[PDB]
PDB file of C-alpha atoms in Angstrom:
ATOM      1  CA  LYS A   1     -15.290   3.927   1.753  1.00 26.39           C
ATOM      2  CA  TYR A   2     -16.161   6.277   4.710  1.00 28.12           C
ATOM      3  CA  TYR A   3     -13.200   8.524   3.753  1.00 25.09           C
ATOM      4  CA  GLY A   4     -10.379   8.014   1.159  1.00 28.04           C
ATOM      5  CA  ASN A   5      -7.487  10.605   0.966  1.00 29.76           C
ATOM      6  CA  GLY A   6      -5.238   9.355   3.761  1.00 27.83           C
ATOM      7  CA  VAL A   7      -7.149   6.330   5.273  1.00 30.55           C
ATOM      8  CA  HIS A   8     -10.444   4.761   4.027  1.00 32.60           C
ATOM      9  CA  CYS A   9     -12.014   3.682   7.351  1.00 34.37           C
ATOM     10  CA  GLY A  10     -11.167   2.079  10.768  1.00 31.73           C
ATOM     11  CA  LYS A  11     -11.749  -1.039  13.015  1.00 30.64           C
ATOM     12  CA  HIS A  12     -14.954  -1.449  10.913  1.00 32.82           C
ATOM     13  CA  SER A  13     -12.792  -3.152   8.174  1.00 34.34           C
ATOM     14  CA  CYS A  14     -11.202  -0.547   5.838  1.00 34.02           C
ATOM     15  CA  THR A  15      -8.450   1.608   7.453  1.00 35.73           C
ATOM     16  CA  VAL A  16      -5.317   1.635   5.104  1.00 36.97           C
ATOM     17  CA  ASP A  17      -3.298   4.599   4.133  1.00 36.74           C
ATOM     18  CA  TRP A  18      -0.439   2.001   4.340  1.00 35.50           C
ATOM     19  CA  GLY A  19      -1.450  -1.575   3.195  1.00 34.80           C
ATOM     20  CA  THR A  20      -1.675  -0.502  -0.507  1.00 34.06           C
ATOM     21  CA  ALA A  21       1.881   0.963  -0.273  1.00 32.21           C
ATOM     22  CA  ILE A  22       3.318  -2.228   1.409  1.00 32.92           C
ATOM     23  CA  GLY A  23       1.302  -4.288  -1.169  1.00 32.84           C
ATOM     24  CA  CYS A  24       3.008  -2.412  -4.079  1.00 34.73           C
ATOM     25  CA  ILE A  25       6.450  -2.923  -2.384  1.00 36.37           C
ATOM     26  CA  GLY A  26       6.094  -6.580  -1.241  1.00 35.94           C
ATOM     27  CA  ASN A  27       4.835  -7.956  -4.609  1.00 34.21           C
ATOM     28  CA  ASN A  28       7.288  -6.123  -6.929  1.00 34.54           C
ATOM     29  CA  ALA A  29      10.187  -6.700  -4.504  1.00 34.40           C
ATOM     30  CA  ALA A  30      10.032 -10.500  -4.375  1.00 35.34           C
ATOM     31  CA  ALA A  31       9.350 -10.502  -8.172  1.00 30.52           C
ATOM     32  CA  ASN A  32      12.792  -8.800  -8.803  1.00 31.34           C
ATOM     33  CA  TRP A  33      14.874  -8.672  -5.593  1.00 31.01           C
ATOM     34  CA  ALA A  34      13.915  -7.064  -2.179  1.00 29.49           C
ATOM     35  CA  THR A  35      12.742  -3.724  -3.793  1.00 29.64           C
ATOM     36  CA  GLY A  36      12.290  -4.069  -7.597  1.00 28.94           C
ATOM     37  CA  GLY A  37      16.027  -3.619  -8.535  1.00 35.16           C
ATOM     38  CA  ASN A  38      15.278   0.210  -8.597  1.00 33.40           C
ATOM     39  CA  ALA A  39      11.823   0.765  -6.852  1.00 33.55           C
ATOM     40  CA  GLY A  40      10.520   1.587 -10.410  1.00 34.99           C
ATOM     41  CA  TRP A  41       7.270  -0.474  -9.866  1.00 35.37           C
ATOM     42  CA  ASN A  42       5.734   3.015  -9.588  1.00 32.18           C
ATOM     43  CA  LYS A  43       6.606   3.426  -6.288  1.00 36.77           C
ATOM     44  CA  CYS A  44       3.473   3.977  -4.140  1.00 39.09           C
TER      45      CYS A  44
END
């Protein structure tokens, strides 16, 4: 976006080195369990 290898921007809108990782977790967790039965979703 304005960067992208550890965070993408800031208070602008982007930010995130973290919200992809918690997105991977939260989705695949509640699909199986609380973390995927084994965290084998890929983990992020």
